[PDB]
Amino acid sequence: MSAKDERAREILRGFKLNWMNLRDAETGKILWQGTEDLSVPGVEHEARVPKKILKCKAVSRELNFSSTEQMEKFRLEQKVYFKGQCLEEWFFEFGFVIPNSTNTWQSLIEAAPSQMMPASVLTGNVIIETKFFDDDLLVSTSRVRLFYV
Numbered sequence: 001m002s003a004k005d006e007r008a009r010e011i012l013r014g015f016k017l018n019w020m021n022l023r024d025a026e027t028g029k030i031l032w033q034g035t036e037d038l039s040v041p042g043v044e045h046e047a048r049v050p051k052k053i054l055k056c057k058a059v060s061r062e063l064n065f066s067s068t069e070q071m072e073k074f075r076l077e078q079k080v081y082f083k084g085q086c087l088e089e090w091f092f093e094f095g096f097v098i099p100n101s102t103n104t105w106q107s108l109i110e111a112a113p114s115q116m117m118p119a120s121v122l123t124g125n126v127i128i129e130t131k132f133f134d135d136d137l138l139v140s141t142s143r144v145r146l147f148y149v
């Protein structure tokens with residue numbers, strides 16, 4: 001165990017995703033919302049999402065989170081996996097996090113013209129992997145399996 005491993009565990013222990021939603025970045029329409037902490041590691045989460053999301057050039061995300069611990073550079077790396085192959089990756093940076101704060105993070109997520117296979121082929125075969133970092137310290141990795149409905 002290193003000092004860094006111990007730190008990453010303290011950060012994870014103090015972290016919660018309280019709620020989240022997704023919107024077409026054209027309409028601002030809600031496409032999905034939830035309060036399950038999809039960031040919790042070690043379980044495969046499941047989400048059902050409307051199939052039309054696949055027709056959106058971009059989506060806007062609101063992610064509401066609490067952190068007991070101070071973070072210098074809170075960031076995420078997110079990958080779409082189809083039957084085990086990475087189709088697309090995104091990097092997003094929140095930056096400094098105040099200890100014991102609760103924060104809403106808005107992000108614009110742009111698909112590359114990926115999300116090209118039909119929803120019927122995709123559904124149950126897509127995993128979004130999310131890695132949570134503070135700078136280069138890996139805090140956690142979680143996974144959501146997607147169903148398009």
Ligand SMILES: O=C1c2ccccc2N[C@@H](c2ccccc2F)N1c1ccccc1
Pocket residue numbers: 017020022032038039047059061063078090109128130144146
């Ligand atoms: O941002 C998230 C997200 C945030 C915290 C924890 C897990 C996440 N996984 C996906 C995501 C968001 C909403 C619904 C399902 C889903 F898999 N996700 C997402 C949404 C769009 C593009 C890339 C990742």
Ligand SMILES: O=C1c2ccccc2N[C@H](c2ccccc2F)N1c1ccccc1
Pocket residue numbers: 022049053054056057058059080087088109110111114115116122126128146
């Ligand atoms: O299915 C989605 C999607 C659905 C809900 C939440 C996150 C998702 N990640 C991407 C995606 C789809 C549309 C717009 C942006 C985007 F990152 N995405 C996707 C999936 C497979 C191939 C390409 C993009």
